[PDB]
Amino acid sequence: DISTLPRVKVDLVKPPFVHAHDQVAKTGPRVVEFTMTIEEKKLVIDREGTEIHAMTFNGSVPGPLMVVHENDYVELRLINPDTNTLLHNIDFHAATGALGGGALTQVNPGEETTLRFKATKPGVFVYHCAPEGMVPWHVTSGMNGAIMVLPRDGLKDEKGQPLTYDKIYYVGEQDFYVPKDEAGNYKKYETPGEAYEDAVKAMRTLTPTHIVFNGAVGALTGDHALTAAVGERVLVVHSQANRDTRPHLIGGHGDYVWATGKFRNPPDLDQETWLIPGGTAGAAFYTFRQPGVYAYVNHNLIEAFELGAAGHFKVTGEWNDDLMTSVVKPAS
Amino acid sequence: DISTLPRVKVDLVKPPFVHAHDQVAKTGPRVVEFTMTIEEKKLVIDREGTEIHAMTFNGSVPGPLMVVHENDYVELRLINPDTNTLLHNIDFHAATGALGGGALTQVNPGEETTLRFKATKPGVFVYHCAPEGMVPWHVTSGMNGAIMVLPRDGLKDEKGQPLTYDKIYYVGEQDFYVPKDEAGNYKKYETPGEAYEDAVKAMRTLTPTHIVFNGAVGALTGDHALTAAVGERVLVVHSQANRDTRPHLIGGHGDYVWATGKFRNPPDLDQETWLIPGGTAGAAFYTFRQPGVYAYVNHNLIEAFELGAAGHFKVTGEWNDDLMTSVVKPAS
Amino acid sequence: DISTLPRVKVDLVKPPFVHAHDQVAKTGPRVVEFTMTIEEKKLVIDREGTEIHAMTFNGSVPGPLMVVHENDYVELRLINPDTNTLLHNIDFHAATGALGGGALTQVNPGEETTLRFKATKPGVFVYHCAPEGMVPWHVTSGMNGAIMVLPRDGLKDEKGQPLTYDKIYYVGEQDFYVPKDEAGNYKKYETPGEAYEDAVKAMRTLTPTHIVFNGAVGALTGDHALTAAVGERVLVVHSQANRDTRPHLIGGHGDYVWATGKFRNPPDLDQETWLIPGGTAGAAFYTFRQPGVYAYVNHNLIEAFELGAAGHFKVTGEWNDDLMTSVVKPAS
Numbered sequence: 001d002i003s004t005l006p007r008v009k010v011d012l013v014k015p016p017f018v019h020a021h022d023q024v025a026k027t028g029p030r031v032v033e034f035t036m037t038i039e040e041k042k043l044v045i046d047r048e049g050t051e052i053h054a055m056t057f058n059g060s061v062p063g064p065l066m067v068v069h070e071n072d073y074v075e076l077r078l079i080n081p082d083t084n085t086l087l088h089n090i091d092f093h094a095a096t097g098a099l100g101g102g103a104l105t106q107v108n109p110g111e112e113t114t115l116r117f118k119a120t121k122p123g124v125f126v127y128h129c130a131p132e133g134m135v136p137w138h139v140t141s142g143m144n145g146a147i148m149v150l151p152r153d154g155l156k157d158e159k160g161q162p163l164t165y166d167k168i169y170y171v172g173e174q175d176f177y178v179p180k181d182e183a184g185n186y187k188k189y190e191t192p193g194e195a196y197e198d199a200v201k202a203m204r205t206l207t208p209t210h211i212v213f214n215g216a217v218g219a220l221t222g223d224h225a226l227t228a229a230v231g232e233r234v235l236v237v238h239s240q241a242n243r244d245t246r247p248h249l250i251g252g253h254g255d256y257v258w259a260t261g262k263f264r265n266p267p268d269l270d271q272e273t274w275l276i277p278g279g280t281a282g283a284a285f286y287t288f289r290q291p292g293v294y295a296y297v298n299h300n301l302i303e304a305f306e307l308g309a310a311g312h313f314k315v316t317g318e319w320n321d322d323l324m325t326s327v328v329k330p331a332s
Numbered sequence: 333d334i335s336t337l338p339r340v341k342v343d344l345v346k347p348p349f350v351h352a353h354d355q356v357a358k359t360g361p362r363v364v365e366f367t368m369t370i371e372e373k374k375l376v377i378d379r380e381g382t383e384i385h386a387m388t389f390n391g392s393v394p395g396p397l398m399v400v401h402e403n404d405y406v407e408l409r410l411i412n413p414d415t416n417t418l419l420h421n422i423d424f425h426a427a428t429g430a431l432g433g434g435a436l437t438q439v440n441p442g443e444e445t446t447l448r449f450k451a452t453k454p455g456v457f458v459y460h461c462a463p464e465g466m467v468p469w470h471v472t473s474g475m476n477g478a479i480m481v482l483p484r485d486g487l488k489d490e491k492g493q494p495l496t497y498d499k500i501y502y503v504g505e506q507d508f509y510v511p512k513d514e515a516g517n518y519k520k521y522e523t524p525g526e527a528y529e530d531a532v533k534a535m536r537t538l539t540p541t542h543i544v545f546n547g548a549v550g551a552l553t554g555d556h557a558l559t560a561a562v563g564e565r566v567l568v569v570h571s572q573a574n575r576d577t578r579p580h581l582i583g584g585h586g587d588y589v590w591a592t593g594k595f596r597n598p599p600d601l602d603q604e605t606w607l608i609p610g611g612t613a614g615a616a617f618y619t620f621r622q623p624g625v626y627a628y629v630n631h632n633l634i635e636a637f638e639l640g641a642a643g644h645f646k647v648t649g650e651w652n653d654d655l656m657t658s659v660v661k662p663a664s
Numbered sequence: 665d666i667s668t669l670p671r672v673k674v675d676l677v678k679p680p681f682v683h684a685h686d687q688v689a690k691t692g693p694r695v696v697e698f699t700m701t702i703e704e705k706k707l708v709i710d711r712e713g714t715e716i717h718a719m720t721f722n723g724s725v726p727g728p729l730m731v732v733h734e735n736d737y738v739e740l741r742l743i744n745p746d747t748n749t750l751l752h753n754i755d756f757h758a759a760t761g762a763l764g765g766g767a768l769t770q771v772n773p774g775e776e777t778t779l780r781f782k783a784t785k786p787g788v789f790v791y792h793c794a795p796e797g798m799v800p801w802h803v804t805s806g807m808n809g810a811i812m813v814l815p816r817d818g819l820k821d822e823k824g825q826p827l828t829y830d831k832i833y834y835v836g837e838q839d840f841y842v843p844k845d846e847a848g849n850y851k852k853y854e855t856p857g858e859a860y861e862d863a864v865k866a867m868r869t870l871t872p873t874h875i876v877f878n879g880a881v882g883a884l885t886g887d888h889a890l891t892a893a894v895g896e897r898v899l900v901v902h903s904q905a906n907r908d909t910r911p912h913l914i915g916g917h918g919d920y921v922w923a924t925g926k927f928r929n930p931p932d933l934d935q936e937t938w939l940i941p942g943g944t945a946g947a948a949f950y951t952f953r954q955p956g957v958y959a960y961v962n963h964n965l966i967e968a969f970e971l972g973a974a975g976h977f978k979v980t981g982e983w984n985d986d987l988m989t990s991v992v993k994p995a996s
């Protein structure tokens with residue numbers, strides 16, 4: 001009887017940050033209420049000024065990370081304002097039935113809908129738009145995110161002991177397919193609908209023009225680099241709704257990794273690089289041991305350094321010479 | 333002494349169906365006899381009427397699923413009728429030695445051969461044609477299938493308890509590389525041999541023109557959708573002999589998954605999407621909990637919805653509102 | 665106090681061979697000293713005579729395999745002779761901090777440097793050059809290798825029992841992106857620097873022109889085929905610093921496989937094919953049971969047989985008819 005359960009309303013935050021939550025559940029099962037507003041918007045995705053018409057949940061690419069516990073109910077109010085132009089919906093990979101909710105959430109501009117599902121399987125999971133006949137166009141225009149369903153007793157290592165993170169970040173990785181003219185220059189369009197047949201052609205090459213974290217080349221750098229301190233335990237949730245990726249922390253490891261993101265399985269230990277298949281979210285746990293700049297990349301290094309799939313961590317603290325040291329500095 | 337073992341002759345069935353077998357072995361080890369006839373045939377692979385010269389085992393793409401138990405012997409009579417034009421052979425990934433049988437089964441048109449091997453490792457495994465110097469051309473023209481070697485005591489979950497399936501389907505996923513003219517139109521040829529150098533060029537792009545289940549765009553839809561009922565336990569065996577895929581059941585999960593297909597390993601639990609590497613067969617177990625239409629896709633959604641790698645399940649039974657419900661239907 | 669530890673100097677060998685080492689550590693922790701000299705050189709990579717300017721560690725592609733034990737210290741003297749033209753460095757995925765050593769090892773032509781790091785995690789790991797702003801160009805010109813950090817008590821199976829190998833080989837798999845003219849012919853350049861902007865363009869296609877083992881099409885064939893005898897236990901270490909691969913031993917299996925290369929995890933058993941993600945090293949253990957020629961391939965068979973990712977094993981010993989036999993040889 002869902003009417004007797006507590007309701008809690010969560011206000012979402014912009015990636016790569018994640019809304020406040022408890023790791024170990026401090027209440028019984030709840031109905032967790034979220035609201036998302038769909039926003040079609042122009043986005044500049046690279047240093048050259050290339051512009052696309054992005055399709056977003058809550059204004060960002062990726063959409064925000066939702067966090068619940070196993071056997072909570074997720075109730076999402078999804079709003080498609082009349083300032084948009086397309087029909088949208090939502091498919092949660094966490095959910096069971098009706099194409100993950102997709103069959104029940106088709107909203108034209110000026111409509112809203114409220115969906116409820118029970119979060120029966122713990123893990124991180126992708127969610128994405130999936131309108132009949134235009135599924136890859138919406139997804140590859142940015143209309144995807146993830147949801148984390150924590151076990152009620154939090155995360156566990158390969159021996160069943162508790163793993164507690166101090167910080168959590170969400171990296172959404174996006175493959176874009178910007179149409180090109182004859183000579184290879186990117187095309188601009190005034191409306192999303194203009195791009196349609198050119199988008200289909202660009203997608204069928206299976207070759208992205210850009211692969212980015214958090215919606216743009218260089219988004220997780222400079223003032224927007226991820227931060228941590230030596231000794232901190234960090235969980236990085238990484239999703240890719242359409243195409244395989246292989247995350248790597250340059251200068252670190254994945255101490256505990258759930259590459260396909262499902263927490264009833266034991267983690268893989270000591271990973272250098274891990275494969276997250278397209279249509280999946282994964283999670284990696286690392287304890288920082290050295291200060292400085294780290295790069296977090298898709299380790300197809302062309303995809304990283306030429307197409308955009310690279311961000312930075314900036315880590316403060318004390319250097320440990322026992323782990324690494326320069327014995328003789330570069331000299332002639 | 334193989335002469336004292338029982339022989340049993342199995343008549344194969346067309347994918348996605350699978351020949352009758354017992355999960356738990358009801359006899360001791362047997363010599364299991366199969367016959368396959370090679371058929372080169374014209375195939376229409378898409379809605380536009382694109383035609384290729386396919387190279388098939390037993391008339392289908394994929395070839396049929398063979399099912400034995402661990403430590404049975406597989407005896408295959410392979411027939412290459414004189415109405416074909418090419419030399420063919422067979423390589424079983426399940427077998428040990430002689431290039432998986434490939435070195436011993438080279439049959440010109442008008443020849444046959446009988447191979448026997450011991451099925452020493454349990455799992456699902458790819459088989460494919462692999463003639464010296466033309467291996468990828470045969471495989472990517474459809475000349476591949478799979479064999480399942482069950483443990484004698486059937487399948488087990490991660491705790492070693494029995495898993496029994498009620499139904500089993502075989503999805504063979506095929507990457508095709510149809511040659512194109514200058515403008516991008518598909519070429520037609522009168523014989524398989526005509527296509528050869530154009531096929532090599534198309535393959536070297538590493539970009540398929542079509543990726544299909546069961547030999548054509550839309551093959552596992554409509555009247556040919558897969559079926560199940562709420563409460564049924566379904567095993568889906570999925571192979572890809574040449575290129576990685578990432579299956580996903582839209583609206584469901586892989587409750588127990590052997591992504592690389594080998595049953596002495598514990599399954600991965602609660603998977604949203606899993607990676608089957610090219611040259612591998614995998615298997616996923618799911619118990620249906622909700623009725624309706626499900627889509628089973630490669631979750632590179634371009635490969636699914638633009639290139640053809642999507643099929644449907646149609647599931648009958650009772651809707652469970654506790655798992656999912658529309659609280660407020662789309663409305664303005 | 666590192667000054668009181670034993671030092672040992674290791675002389676490296678050319679892949680696919682591996683320098684002598686003990687599986688089970690016969691000493692306490694040591695400082696293990698290696699020297700590598702960077703060599704930019706012209707390399708012929710295919711039968712047609714296509715030439716590239718390769719960037720190598722110690723003259724080979726891949727660079728040599730280094731072998732230490734967990735909690736040894738690795739001290740590498742890296743030398744960039746003044747006959748080279750570019751700045752280079754080294755990033756070890758095995759190491760913790762400073763971009764895996766990359767930030768501390770930038771050597772112009774005519775410089776050297778000595779780096780020390782503690783090998784705290786057991787596994788096989790990639791190392792590669794990674795100079796600021798030109799990372800994929802160096803890596804995809806051949807400037808990568810691997811390091812194996814053995815547990816002090818050697819390798820273990822899924823039940824924690826010892827696994828001892830009789831022979832070990834190192835297969836480095838390399839994706840090359842040779843620039844092409846308008847018609848599709850490969851370009852030649854006099855110096856590495858000439859190629860730069862053409863290399864970036866070729867890389868951005870994400871489509872390699874060649875994928876090779878040990879630096880050339882056919883390198884591990886003929887007189888240079890890998891060898892073993894029936895009954896021998898062979899460990900094959902395989903790396904790919906930039907792009908996913910899916911190794912398969914044609915006619916065999918991976919009896920015990922660490923696909924992502926980290927030995928605190930239990931191995932996967934009975935693998936037909938396994939995925940090594942780009943930026944990773946993996947390891948497979950197999951006991952040969954049948955004599956003859958085996959092919960070891962990336963099982964995207966186009967990448968194998970058209971682009972070059974195939975080698976051979978030649979195995980001596982006795983044929984076992986119980987495992988496989990021709991019952992009726994090909995006949996009309």
Ligand SMILES: O=N[O-]
Pocket residue numbers: 040041042053054191192
């Ligand atoms: O405002 N662009 O959808």
Ligand SMILES: O=N[O-]
Pocket residue numbers: 079080081082109110111112664
């Ligand atoms: O856009 N309707 O709430």
Ligand SMILES: O=N[O-]
Pocket residue numbers: 242243244245278631632
């Ligand atoms: O599905 N693309 O890796």
Ligand SMILES: O=N[O-]
Pocket residue numbers: 243244245300303
């Ligand atoms: O192929 N996915 O990077």
Ligand SMILES: O=N[O-]
Pocket residue numbers: 248250251299755756757763764794
């Ligand atoms: O070691 N990072 O490419």
Ligand SMILES: O=N[O-]
Pocket residue numbers: 257258259260261262263265600601603
């Ligand atoms: O899917 N579990 O890593």
Ligand SMILES: O=N[O-]
Pocket residue numbers: 372373374385386523524
């Ligand atoms: O009949 N075509 O091979």
Ligand SMILES: O=N[O-]
Pocket residue numbers: 411412413414441442443444996
């Ligand atoms: O085609 N010979 O049986």
Ligand SMILES: O=N[O-]
Pocket residue numbers: 574575576577610963964
């Ligand atoms: O091997 N192709 O994913």
Ligand SMILES: O=N[O-]
Pocket residue numbers: 575576577632635
């Ligand atoms: O790259 N395989 O879809």
Ligand SMILES: O=N[O-]
Pocket residue numbers: 091092093099100130580582583631
């Ligand atoms: O959730 N299916 O793409």
Ligand SMILES: O=N[O-]
Pocket residue numbers: 589590591592593594595597932933935
């Ligand atoms: O290969 N076993 O999933």
Ligand SMILES: O=N[O-]
Pocket residue numbers: 704705706717718855856
């Ligand atoms: O000698 N070529 O770098």
Ligand SMILES: O=N[O-]
Pocket residue numbers: 332743744745746773774775776
């Ligand atoms: O090249 N300096 O040792």
Ligand SMILES: O=N[O-]
Pocket residue numbers: 299300906907908909942
């Ligand atoms: O990262 N390329 O498979």
Ligand SMILES: O=N[O-]
Pocket residue numbers: 907908909964967
């Ligand atoms: O996509 N890697 O073969």
